[PDB]
Amino acid sequence: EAIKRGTVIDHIPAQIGFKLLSLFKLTETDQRITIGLNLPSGEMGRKDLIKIENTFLSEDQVDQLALYAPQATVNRIDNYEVVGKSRPSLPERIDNVLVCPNSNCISHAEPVSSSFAVRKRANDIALKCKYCEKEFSHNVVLAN
C-alpha cells in the first residue's frame, strides 16, 4: 500500500484520523487517498494513518495538526521515495476550524472564518479570538 508521490501523515493518535479528515476537508479532492484507522503500532500501540497522493502540505498546513496530532510525522514521498520528514509545531494562528466559545461573539452569525491567536502557556494553550478578543484555554475551545 505504498505510494509513488504525495504526502503520508503517520503516527496519528487513534480517534484523531477521522477528525483530521473532517476538519481539514482532506477528502474533498479527486486525488487517490488511502487511510488506515486503529492500526497496531508498538511505536505507540494503536495509530491512524493518512496517505494523500499528488498533494503536499506547506509548513503552516502541517502546523495546523499540532492541536490534534502533536506527535505525528508528515512524510513527503516522490518516485516512491521518502524525500521529506516533518513534525507539527505550534502555529501562531489557527483559522477556520475552531469555534469561539463566547456566544455573543460576532463570529457566529456571519460570513467570516474563525481566527484565534495561539499563545503557549506552561500547562496549556491560550486561544484568543480575533473578533471578540476573549482568550480561552484550548481545552474549552476544543470541547465544542
Binding site: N104, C105, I106, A109, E110, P111, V112, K130, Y131, E133
Partner: protein, 310 residues
C-alpha cells in the same frame, strides 16, 4: 500622512503609547483652536445598532464641530439589517459605498472588527462592541487625566465599583499600563473584582496594584478616583444594600484628598456619586464628558485628514 490616517480604530490593544499621545495632542490643539471646516464635504455614518444617546450625541457633535455631514440610525427594538435578517457583513458592504467613515456601536463583541473586513477603504471607529472595547471612552478618559494631572506616568489611580464587568475600566487599565510607573488601587465588592487576566497583565509588566475594601483606605494618596456604575442586576437587592456603602462617594469622604485629585465617572452616576460632590473642586465628571468632544474630534481628524493637525 499622520500615523493614524485612514486607520480603523477598534481596540485600545491595537494602539501604541505613541498613538495615544498623538490623539491626545491633537485633542489639545483642536480644543485650543477649533477647525470648523476641516472635514467639510465628508459624510460620516453614525450607526448605533445598539442605542446609546449620550455616546451618539457626543460623537455627532464632534462630527459637526469639524464641519462633516452626518447620516445614521439608532436601534431601539427594530431594524432589519446588521442584526435581524441581513448580515452585518452585508449592511457594512452597502454602507461603505455611501460614506467616508463609519462610527458604529453594536451589542455583539467583535462587531466593529468584522466591519473592517467589509468596509473596503472606509475607516471604522468602534463606539462600543458588547463587553469588549470602547476606545473613544478610554481616549477621553486619558485626555482628562493628562489635562488635570499634567502627565500619564507615575500616577496613583483608584478604580471603584463594578471592576469585573466594566469594559471601560478594563481598557483604561490597559491604556494606563502602556505608560510608566502607574500604581493602581482596586476598590470593589468581592463579587465584582477586577478580573485575573488584567491582574496578570499588570504583574508581567511589574506594575504595582493593591485591593482595598473602601475608598478611605487610599483617599490620601490618589491623583485619580475613577468611579463606575454598579447596575442593580449584577447583584441581588439585599446583597446590593449590604455592600453599596463601599462604592458610593460623598463630599465628606474627600476631607483628606490631595489638591490635584479629580473624581471621574463615565456616567450615568445616579447611584454612586452624591450630588454634594458636584461643587467640590475634585468633581470632574462633567468636564470629562465635555472632553469626549475633543478626543472624538481628534480621532476623526486624524483618520480622515492626511496632514497632522497644527
Amino acid at each position: 500622512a499622520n500615523p493614524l490616517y485612514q486607520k480603523h480604530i477598534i481596540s485600545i490593544n491595537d494602539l501604541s503609547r505613541d498613538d495615544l499621545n498623538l490623539v491626545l495632542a491633537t485633542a489639545a490643539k483642536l480644543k485650543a483652536n477649533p477647525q470648523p471646516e476641516l472635514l467639510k464635504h465628508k459624510v460620516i455614518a453614525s450607526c448605533f445598532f445598539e442605542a446609546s444617546t449620550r455616546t451618539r450625541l457626543s460623537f455627532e457633535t464632534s462630527m459637526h464641530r469639524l464641519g462633516a455631514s452626518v447620516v445614521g440610525f439608532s436601534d431601539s427594538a427594530n431594524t432589519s439589517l446588521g442584526k435581524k435578517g441581513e448580515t452585518l457583513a452585508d449592511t457594512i458592504s452597502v454602507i461603505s459605498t455611501y460614506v467616508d467613515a463609519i462610527v458604529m456601536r453594536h451589542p455583539q463583541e467583535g462587531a466593529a472588527r468584522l466591519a473592517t473586513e467589509f468596509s473596503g477603504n472606509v475607516p471604522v471607529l468602534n463606539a462600543g462592541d458588547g463587553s469588549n472595547q470602547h476606545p473613544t471612552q478610554t481616549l477621553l478618559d486619558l485626555f482628562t487625566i493628562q489635562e488635570t494631572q499634567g502627565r500619564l506616568d507615575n500616577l496613583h489611580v483608584a478604580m471603584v465599583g463594578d471592576l469585573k464587568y466594566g469594559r471601560t475600566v478594563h481598557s483604561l487599565t490597559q491604556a494606563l499600563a502602556k505608560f510608566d510607573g502607574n500604581r493602581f488601587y482596586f476598590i470593589a465588592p468581592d463579587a465584582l473584582a477586577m478580573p485575573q487576566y488584567i491582574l496578570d497583565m499588570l504583574d508581567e509588566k511589574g506594575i504595582a496594584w493593591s485591593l482595598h475594601s473602601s475608598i478611605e483606605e487610599v483617599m490620601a494618596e490618589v491623583d485619580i478616583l475613577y468611579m463606575t456604575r454598579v447596575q442593580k442586576e449584577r447583584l441581588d437587592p439585599s446583597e446590593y444594600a449590604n455592600v453599596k456603602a463601599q462604592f458610593v462617594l460623598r463630599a465628606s469622604d474627600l476631607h483628606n484628598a490631595k489638591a490635584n485629585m479629580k473624581v471621574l465617572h463615565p456616567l450615568p452616576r445616579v447611584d454612586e456619586i452624591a450630588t454634594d460632590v458636584d461643587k467640590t473642586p475634585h468633581a470632574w465628571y462633567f468636564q470629562q464628558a465635555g472632553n469626549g468632544i475633543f478626543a472624538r474630534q481628534a480621532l476623526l481628524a486624524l483618520v480622515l485628514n492626511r496632514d497632522l493637525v497644527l
